Amino acid sequence: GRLRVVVLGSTGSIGTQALQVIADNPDRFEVVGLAAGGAHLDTLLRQRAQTGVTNIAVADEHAAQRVGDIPYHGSDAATRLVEQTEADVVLNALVGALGLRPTLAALKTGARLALANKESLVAGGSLVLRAARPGQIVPVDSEHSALAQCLRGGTPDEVAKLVLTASGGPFRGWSAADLEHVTPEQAGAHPTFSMGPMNTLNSASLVNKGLEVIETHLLFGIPYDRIDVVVHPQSIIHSMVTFIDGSTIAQASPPDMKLPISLALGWPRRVSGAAAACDFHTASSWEFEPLDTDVFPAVELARQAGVAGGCMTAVYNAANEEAAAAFLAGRIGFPAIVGIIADVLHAADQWAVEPATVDDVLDAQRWARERAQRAVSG
Amino acid sequence: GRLRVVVLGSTGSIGTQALQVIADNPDRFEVVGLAAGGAHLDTLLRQRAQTGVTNIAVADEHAAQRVGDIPYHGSDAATRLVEQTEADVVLNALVGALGLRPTLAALKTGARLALANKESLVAGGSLVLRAARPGQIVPVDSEHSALAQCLRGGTPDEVAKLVLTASGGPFRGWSAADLEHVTPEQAGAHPTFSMGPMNTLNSASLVNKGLEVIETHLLFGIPYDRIDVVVHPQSIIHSMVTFIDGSTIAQASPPDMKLPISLALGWPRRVSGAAAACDFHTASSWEFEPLDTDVFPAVELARQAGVAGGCMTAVYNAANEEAAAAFLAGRIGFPAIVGIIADVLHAADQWAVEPATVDDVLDAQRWARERAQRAVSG
Ligand SMILES: NC(=O)C1=CN([C@@H]2O[C@H](COP(=O)(O)OP(=O)(O)OC[C@H]3O[C@@H](n4cnc5c(N)ncnc54)[C@H](OP(=O)(O)O)[C@@H]3O)[C@@H](O)[C@H]2O)C=CC1
Ligand SMILES: NC(=O)C1=CN([C@@H]2O[C@H](COP(=O)(O)OP(=O)(O)OC[C@H]3O[C@@H](n4cnc5c(N)ncnc54)[C@H](OP(=O)(O)O)[C@@H]3O)[C@@H](O)[C@H]2O)C=CC1
Ligand SMILES: O=CN(O)CCCP(=O)(O)O
Ligand SMILES: O=CN(O)CCCP(=O)(O)O
Ligand SMILES: [Mn+2]
Numbered sequence A, B: 001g002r003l004r005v006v007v008l009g010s011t012g013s014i015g016t017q018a019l020q021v022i023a024d025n026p027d028r029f030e031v032v033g034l035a036a037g038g039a040h041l042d043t044l045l046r047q048r049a050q051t052g053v054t055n056i057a058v059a060d061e062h063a064a065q066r067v068g069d070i071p072y073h074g075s076d077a078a079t080r081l082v083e084q085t086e087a088d089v090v091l092n093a094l095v096g097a098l099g100l101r102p103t104l105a106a107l108k109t110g111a112r113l114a115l116a117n118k119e120s121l122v123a124g125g126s127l128v129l130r131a132a133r134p135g136q137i138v139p140v141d142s143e144h145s146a147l148a149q150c151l152r153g154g155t156p157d158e159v160a161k162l163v164l165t166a167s168g169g170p171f172r173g174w175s176a177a178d179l180e181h182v183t184p185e186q187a188g189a190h191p192t193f194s195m196g197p198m199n200t201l202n203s204a205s206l207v208n209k210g211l212e213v214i215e216t217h218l219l220f221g222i223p224y225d226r227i228d229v230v231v232h233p234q235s236i237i238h239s240m241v242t243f244i245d246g247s248t249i250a251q252a253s254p255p256d257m258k259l260p261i262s263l264a265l266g267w268p269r270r271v272s273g274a275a276a277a278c279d280f281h282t283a284s285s286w287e288f289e290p291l292d293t294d295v296f297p298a299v300e301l302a303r304q305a306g307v308a309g310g311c312m313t314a315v316y317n318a319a320n321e322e323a324a325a326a327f328l329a330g331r332i333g334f335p336a337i338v339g340i341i342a343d344v345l346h347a348a349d350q351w352a353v354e355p356a357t358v359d360d361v362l363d364a365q366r367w368a369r370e371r372a373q374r375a376v377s378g
């Protein structure tokens, strides 16, 4: 029962943690493929040497040369890797909507898709769902892993509300005026998780939670009006489900993505010692507070995009990818990220149509990016 | 389609909450039987009138004559009622180990036993388990109801520990010194629940949590070494399960026994609108702290009685009923309640043998009561 696992984005925060889970559990797991972008050759070389896996994709040409003996190069290498490798699980830990084709290819192989790359589901919408069999997509994202666990506690019609926790990011409690003076350095410091740059910045702008609300609707089929967000600064409660009787079931643990990574990999069997459990022999406090939707409208914007449906969620995500890179590049101030997203959505009525093919998602994304790019430069 | 329900201990705290739950849900439940002691005839009268049930047991013979039209009176009336009534569920909401015979009778009818009367399971031990079919006993006690829901989150070999919450009672965090000057009136004030006198006193002394540890062992078959206790002042988290991967699943709601009552009657289907849900629109916090076993040894003493096994858990509870009545009557100080329990337990080596019949359990309890009564006199 040793599962062959393909790991996309092997060099990143999620990817390296997954490799560790796999290294610890050689009886449950075997890595049979790695994909990365090329920006961390050292990490990737170490990974090839350690796992002995030579079946590798690198996206960047110049870097793939520098490493030597890499089978797949270019923008399509991760997708090709997935298409050309027999596997039982594909862990998609890529960042960005560029994970979309690897996601679809992974589902087409019939393997389990252990999905960290939330943007590809957000972008793909129904296109991704229609490509998947029940149970084929298993969430790595911690809120959704928590939700899937909590949902074992009732029948689907017994669900009243899904409740996602948000750490609130480094700027929890700040005012709108305060946000004007945010720096990339300040935004790059998350209170509870160590992550790659994108999720870090998104958790600070709250665009991450917005993505996760959309991701929740897609995976679990609960309407947006029944998906709530509460701020919980400790990130110990990863999410929860309120049932129609007044009962709430919650999943909790010290923040550590190795737990939901482990569960996604071997779903539905749990993996012993994946992560530390809460220590109930020492005092602690789990705090809740509402989100300041006035100062952080990203989640509301995401519900708006999600309710409109179709390619609109792809537009929401693509606008953020442009506006967020712009902030990181010093081209806009921090508040302009969600400002631009709002601008782009409110002019995107033509995209509230369900996509027929990938190309429709790519069209909406290109439109969204061009629109955000103009707002940036102007 | 309606479930026929016998309610033992109908006039008390759990009993009246259950009647209200049943009245609010006539398409699901009907009362077909009531048992009480005879101390509250106005309530009993009111319940007869409101439910339309004359199938009633009253323990006190003179009381039965006063209220009139009672078919079963005497100390065996509750048992005979259960033996002579067709039902789907017997809700045992009696208090004390006197609930033992009705409990054993309920199991023998084949009905589901919705159990609030934890003493009868603690006292009966393996005698009660021998009489039950798998899944026949369904917990009303809130921690065990919580545990049952939380256990849906895994397969049996995936459980690492069950964690019971305790409010800590009115004397949470008090020193041994502070406890010496405790009065009945002060012990009568619970921080989070409103209850009958016995469960009120036991939650102040932490004997209640002790009983619930034993209750946990018996209901779920988890070893004592994997049943932990944590103090949680809000009583919002009702208990939790930690799994081998580090994940904890918890069940939460504002304190209200109507929730576990409703779930026990309708198991496994949830009852819409049974109780209020946690509201996360207003700020709040959930705290956890350890219990100081130097000041409150009741839990460790229970775990010790449980491991010794047999009639020892009967001894533990019987010694408590005796010492607790003494405290309520002003014959001993508050610390001597658990003090006397520990002493009776240390003298009780002869009872670490499993009961063959109910009479063995009865014998152990007489001894334990006499032994405690001796301690009170000095
Ligand atoms: N704790 C976390 O980190 C969490 C992450 N997630 C989600 O998981 C996903 C991964 O996030 P995270 O690990 O933080 O991101 P990182 O930036 O740490 O990792 C990105 C990975 O993708 C590779 N990559 C980047 N661009 C490309 C490309 N064009 N083609 C192929 N590979 C590429 C990178 O390789 P290289 O840098 O070597 O070029 C790296 O291996 C994201 O979608 C994120 O939102 C969700 C919840 C928590
Ligand atoms: N929230 C709560 O109250 C909780 C309660 N429990 C448990 O549920 C059980 C009931 O508790 P609670 O409702 O507080 O108890 P109460 O003292 O409020 O009620 C006791 C009930 O039993 C009846 N009774 C007493 N003696 C006898 C007898 N000899 N024969 C027949 N009936 C008798 C009483 O009738 P009468 O009117 O004559 O006195 C009354 O209806 C206990 O085991 C308790 O530990 C557990 C968790 C929470
Ligand atoms: O699953 C975990 N994460 O998404 C990390 C970020 C948590 P946040 O968005 O609540 O700050
Ligand atoms: O299930 C509810 N109870 O047992 C009420 C007592 C709670 P406590 O023993 O933790 O104070
Ligand atoms: Mn997440």
Ligand SMILES: [Mn+2]
Pocket: B141, B142, B143, B212
């Ligand atoms: Mn209880």
